[PDB]
Ligand binder design. Structure first.
Ligand SMILES: [Cl-]
Ligand SMILES: [Cl-]
Ligand SMILES: [Cl-]
Ligand SMILES: [Cl-]
Ligand SMILES: [Cl-]
Length: 157
């Protein structure tokens, strides 16, 4: 039978992104919401097959709407432990979790507030060791921690 194969998520690496620069708050640049340019200054990643650091390059070019949805749109740059460069783009959404927003709507003090923060990932490299990532779909589960984002990256197998 013709069912497509089952989906498995294979751990890629744990990312720790540093945002150690002031945010450029451009205000409401269209009906879509507030434009925020959030510099990416460095960080690290650590997984079985992929390890290294994030360089000082790029940003999240974010839009925050009137309902507290953030739309993520990034460009940044990885340097593996063995010296390969990998251009990364992430896209996705950050918003209050359904339960957190329900509690707030009832006047119930929520501690801590929880968020839906999920991304898709696109890679570009010329290194033969890492070029599989040029043609593999990948996703992340993220969390803000002050001027940092931590996320677990997975490939679709
Ligand atoms: Cl930059
Ligand atoms: Cl949710
Ligand atoms: Cl979060
Ligand atoms: Cl963010
Ligand atoms: Cl902070």
């Amino acid at each position: 039978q013709y069912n497509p194969p089952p989906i498995q998520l294979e751990p890629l690496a744990k990312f720790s992104v540093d945002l150690n620069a002031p945010v450029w708050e451009l205000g409401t640049t269209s009906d879509a919401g507030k434009r925020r340019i959030i510099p990416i200054t460095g960080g690290t990643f650590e997984g079985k097959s992929l390890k290294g650091r994030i360089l000082n390059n790029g940003a999240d070019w974010q839009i925050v709407d009137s309902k507290g949805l953030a739309i993520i749109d990034t460009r940044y740059l990885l340097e593996t432990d063995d010296g390969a460069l990998i251009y990364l783009q992430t896209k996705g959404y950050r918003h209050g979790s359904a339960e957190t927003l329900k509690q707030l709507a009832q006047g119930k003090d929520v501690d801590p507030k929880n968020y839906y923060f999920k991304i898709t990932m696109q890679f570009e490299t010329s290194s033969p060791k890492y070029s599989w990532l040029n043609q593999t779909v990948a996703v992340g589960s993220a969390m803000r921690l002050g001027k940092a984002v931590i996320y677990d990256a997975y490939t679709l197998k």
